């Protein structure tokens, strides 16, 4: 069991951040959890990989479902992220600050107390590419 030095100097594996984005703690303020997650997503600098992780995980996550609209609202964000990511190669990277907001929409929409188990993930996109 070695992890103390990691907590001391290492960040949050993007996978751990994805599993944390689908978890809500019932004992903490939702706003404090949101700012803690925002800081973790910003410190990682790899918002794209976190979002791709969220995209692969969301169909397998338990989320109180009314008509699966939550997925429809998230397709519009994901489309907003793809436009932003295309614009990063055309324009000086001022737009990079908004990239951390798209992963946090998953915490708002799909974050549930039911999601206690870590879902492992893979990279279907590199294989598909």
């Amino acid at each position: 069991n070695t992890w103390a030095s990691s907590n001391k100097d290492s960040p949050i594996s993007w996978f751990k951040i994805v599993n944390q984005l689908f978890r809500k703690d019932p004992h903490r303020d939702i706003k404090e959890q949101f700012y803690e997650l925002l800081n973790q997503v910003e410190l990682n600098g790899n918002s794209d990989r976190i979002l791709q992780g969220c995209f692969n995980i969301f169909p397998y996550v338990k989320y109180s479902d009314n008509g699966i609209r939550k997925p429809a609202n998230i397709s519009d964000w994901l489309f907003f992220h793809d436009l932003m990511y295309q614009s990063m190669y055309a324009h000086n990277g001022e737009l990079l600050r908004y990239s951390a907001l798209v992963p946090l929409v998953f915490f708002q929409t799909f974050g549930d107390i039911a999601n206690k188990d870590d879902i492992r993930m893979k990279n279907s996109e590199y294989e598909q590419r």
Binding site: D9, S10, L83, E94, L95, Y98
Partner: protein, 319 residues
């Protein structure tokens, strides 16, 4: 004119650890370290202008005495700090023989450690590990996350925080007493308000106001050093009626020469860091502030786009 005088930030730069009005805990820690010796590897992180470089400089000076010239190796971001430099010069300095007191060690100060490349940072690990009995490393950075975890594992971590109102007020009062300047309470209050925990910026604004008007008054400070940019943006976004926000944007920001890019970007920051409203409405406001940004980055940056962004934010806040 023939020559200039030294600025008050450099002239009154602290040379002893007692003159630092920063974080008391870390300051007393470094003072006791310099008193006893055995300085370990350290990484000091924080925000610009809070006493990080001055702190490590004072520590090295007090710890080395007269041997500061031949026992301290200073490397800033202005010098090459790549893999070749770490391989040759840093290793030659760490391997250099030097007769020091039985409580001191050679210090390698690396300013702006968050800018060193990954190769140099990786090579520095064994460099600081094999010569940890005659050479010590002190990093000074603004983002501790930019330094690799193996390097952080071999050193202490000192996180410097913002300077409270009392500390900056005390330092400014000391500077005024040492300089015999005419001031007033509201002027110092406005200076500290425009400083935002930045001691260097506070002293710079004080010196500029003194050299421009002579009397440190809130009117002079506000006419020379415009009010904080983020506060007017926050007051504009937190407006309850559309006409008030529009008038604020027109008079305070647009009629004073603030570019639309600065307005929208400052706007994004204010929102991200907002705490008055809920999370969902904040995310919707950030979303709207984004479309206006995309349109302004495409060259469509005008007052109409910001007005439409404010209208959409108010419509979101309109339940």
């Amino acid at each position: 004119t023939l020559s200039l005088q030294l600025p008050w930030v450099e002239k009154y730069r602290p040379q002893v650890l007692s003159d630092i009005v920063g974080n008391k805990e870390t300051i007393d820690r470094l003072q006791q370290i310099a008193k006893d010796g055995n300085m370990p590897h350290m990484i000091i992180s924080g925000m610009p202008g809070i006493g990080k470089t001055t702190s490590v400089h004072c520590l090295a000076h007090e710890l080395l005495g007269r041997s500061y010239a031949d026992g301290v190796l200073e490397l800033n971001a202005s010098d090459d700090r790549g893999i070749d430099v770490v391989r040759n010069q840093i290793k030659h300095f760490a391997q250099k023989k030097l007769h020091l007191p039985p409580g001191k060690h050679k210090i390698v100060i690396l300013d702006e450690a968050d800018s060193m490349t990954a190769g140099a940072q990786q090579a520095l690990r064994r460099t600081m590990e094999l010569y940890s009995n005659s050479t010590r490393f002190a990093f000074a950075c603004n983002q501790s996350n930019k330094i690799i975890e193996p390097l952080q594992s071999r050193c202490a971590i000192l996180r410097y925080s913002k300077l409270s109102d009392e500390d900056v007020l005390k330092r400014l009062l000391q500077i005024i007493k040492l300089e015999d300047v005419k001031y007033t309470n509201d002027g110092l209050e406005a200076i500290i308000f425009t400083a935002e925990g930045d001691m260097r910026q506070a002293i710079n604004n004080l010196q500029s106001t003194v050299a421009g008007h002579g009397l440190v008054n809130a009117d002079n400070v506000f006419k020379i050093v415009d009010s904080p940019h983020p506060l007017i943006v926050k007051k504009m976004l937190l407006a309850s009626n559309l006409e008030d926000s529009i008038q604020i944007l027109r008079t305070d920001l647009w009629k004073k020469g603030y570019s639309s890019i600065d307005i929208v970007t400052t706007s994004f920051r204010v929102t991200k860091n907002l705490a008055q409203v809920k999370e969902s409405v904040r995310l919707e406001m950030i979303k709207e502030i984004g479309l206006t940004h995309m349109r302004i980055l495409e060259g469509v940056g005008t007052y109409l786009q910001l007005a439409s962004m404010l209208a959409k934010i108010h419509k979101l806040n309109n339940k």
